[PDB]
């Protein structure tokens, strides 16, 4: 069972800039013996050359990297992708380019917070998303040789909640916490540690995201965002409407308290500089850690400016000659604007996507922080601490309960306000602190999105594999 049959691969082609990309596809493959939702299937795409004993970009059937992208967003279900898919959500263009690059692609469907089983019961809440990702990885590795590509070169990719999925897969290789769930699903008898991690704006470290958000936006009392509404625009993308508001005095009080506590949290992480010096924040949110955030934004501006991009758009920067020499971070942030209210993730009334993510068999949603549980405005339960810890990529970096991928590439746009810049920065520094390879950046004027720099992503991948 769960044996991949190469006879399932059928010839296909997709046009890419007047150039035809030939490949083979094997679709809707069940990757566990006992699935609980229709979405639990995966698609396999292989450059045609690998069925001819030939090569592509230096790769061959036996050596080709296996890109495993997911379409998870908002911790909702993520259907198995396809290079010919055009319906939102999709990263079809990335698969097209990957195949052209010579990569094998296995796109697995992933359960989400809204997924229900055969009796109408919720079966997609935490930790379903990572369990499915692992099951798919195990299916791939179990089928080494049968499936084209090098199973020792699996590289996950994802955006937003999907970025957290990718990061978690890389950080929690062969963790025993997920064995019971994987066993129940009848997942393939193989490992799930991967080669590398690609993650765009990973929405992770949820239990500390509210504190990080306020450390960043406290003092900015108006918020602005677009909320999805009924109806869809081109290719299934939901329609959106602008919504804004002003923080109540109570929210402002909560904001200050959350920002204050971020100092304690950040300091106890014991993050360090290359020379071992401890990064910190004072009671007012100032300090060596704040300088790192400032410098990343300065570097972001410098990179864009160096390539001919005009950076006069946001406030706060100081330019001397051709160099960005300083930044009034508070000014930049006000210019950027606040997106979410307070708390930004663990809402007191349990109405956020994250609250729903932490619901379970009997609770539609739960709190995942002591603060929101204590100040809940509705009857509520606090999610299991062990579960919260288990889905936080960071938990595995300060311990030895898994096999962590050695290569990481993380991106978070400088215009992305879905979570504080501190969130991805913490992951990046912690990875460096524990000896793991990390390529990190805050791309100038890039919003909450991903897969916008394929040239660099693939160059990074080829660098690791060649």
C-beta of residue 151 within 8 angstroms of C-beta of residue 199: no
Tell me which CATH code domain 1-466 carries: 3.40.50.1820
Token pair listed for 277: 């010096």
Q: What share of the chain is helix, strand, coil (3-state, %, to 5)?
A: 35, 20, 45
Three-state SS for 319? strand
Q: Say if residue 464 is exposed, middle or buried (CB neighbours under 10 Å; 0-12, 13-18, 19+).
A: middle
Resolution in A: 1.8
Taking the alpha carbons of 351, 356, 357, 359 in that order, is the dihedral positive or negative? Answer: positive
Distance in angstroms (rounded) separating the CA atoms of residues 99 and 152: 18
Question: Rounded to 5 degrees, what are φ and ψ at 41?
Answer: -140, 165
Method: X-ray
Span between the terminal Cα atoms of the chain, in Å: 34
Beta bridge partners of 157: 69
Distance in angstroms (rounded) separating the CA atoms of residues 466 and 444: 29
Question: Rounded to 5 degrees, what are φ and ψ at 390?
Answer: -60, -30
Distance in angstroms (rounded) separating the CA atoms of residues 203 and 223: 19
Token pair listed for 18: 């007047």
Q: According to DSSP H, which parts of 358-446 are helical? A: 370-374, 385-390, 422-433
Token pair listed for 197: 């991690």
Q: How far is CA 230 from CA 28, 237, 245, 351, in A?
A: 29, 11, 21, 18
């Amino acid at each position: 069972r769960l044996i991949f049959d190469a006879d399932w691969l059928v010839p296909e082609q997709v046009q890419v800039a007047g150039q035809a990309i030939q490949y083979y596809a094997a679709r809707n493959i069940q990757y566990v013996q006992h699935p609980v939702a229709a979405i639990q299937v995966l698609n396999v795409f292989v450059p045609a050359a690998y069925l001819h004993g030939s090569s592509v970009n230096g790769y061959q059937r036996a050596t080709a990297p296996i890109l495993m992208p997911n379409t998870v967003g908002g911790y909702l279900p993520g259907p198995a992708d396809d290079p010919q898919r055009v319906t939102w959500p999709t990263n079809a263009g990335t698969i097209q380019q990957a195949l052209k690059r010579g990569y094998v692609v296995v796109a697995a469907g992933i359960r989400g917070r809204t997924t229900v089983d055969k009796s109408g019961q919720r079966v997609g809440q935490a930790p379903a998303f990572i369990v499915d990702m692992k099951a798919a990885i195990r299916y791939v590795k179990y089928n080494q040789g049968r499936l084209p590509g090098d199973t020792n070169r699996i590289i996950t990719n994802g955006t937003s909640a999907g970025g957290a999925t990718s990061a978690l897969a890389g950080a929690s290789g062969n963790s025993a916490y997920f064995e019971p769930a994987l066993t129940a699903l009848g997942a393939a008898p193989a490992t799930d540690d991967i080669f590398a991690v690609s993650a765009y704006c990973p929405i992770h470290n949820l239990e500390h995201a509210d504190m990080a958000y306020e450390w960043q936006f406290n003092g900015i009392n108006d918020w602005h965002r677009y909320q999805p509404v009924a109806g869809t625009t081109k290719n299934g993308r939901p329609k959106f409407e602008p919504v804004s508001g002003q923080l109540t005095v109570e929210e402002q009080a909560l904001s200050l308290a959350l920002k204050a506590q971020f100092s304690t949290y950040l300091n106890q992480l014991q993050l360090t500089a290359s020379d071992g010096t401890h990064l910190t924040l004072n009671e007012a949110g100032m300090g060596s850690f704040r300088d790192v955030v400032r410098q990343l934004l300065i570097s972001s501006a410098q990179t864009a400016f160096d390539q001919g991009t005009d950076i006069h758009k946001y406030a706060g920067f100081v330019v001397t000659g051709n160099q960005v020499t300083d930044l009034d971070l508070s000014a930049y942030l006000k210019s950027l604007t606040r997106m979410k209210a307070v708390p930004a993730f663990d809402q007191l009334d349990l109405t956020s996507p994250e609250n729903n993510l932490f619901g379970d068999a009997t609770a539609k949603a739960k709190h995942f922080t002591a603060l929101a549980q204590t100040r809940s405005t509705v009857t509520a339960q606090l999610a299991d601490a062990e579960l919260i810890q288990a889905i936080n990529p960071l938990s595995y970096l300060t311990t030895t309960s898994s096999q962590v991928a050695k290569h990481w590439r993380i991106r978070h746009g400088a215009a992305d306000r879905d979570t504080s810049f501190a969130i991805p920065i913490i992951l990046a520094i912690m990875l460096e602190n524990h000896g793991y390879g990390i390529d990190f950046a805050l791309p100038w004027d890039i919003p909450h999105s991903g897969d916008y720099d394929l040239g660099d992503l693939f160059s990074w991948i080829d660098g690791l594999c060649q």
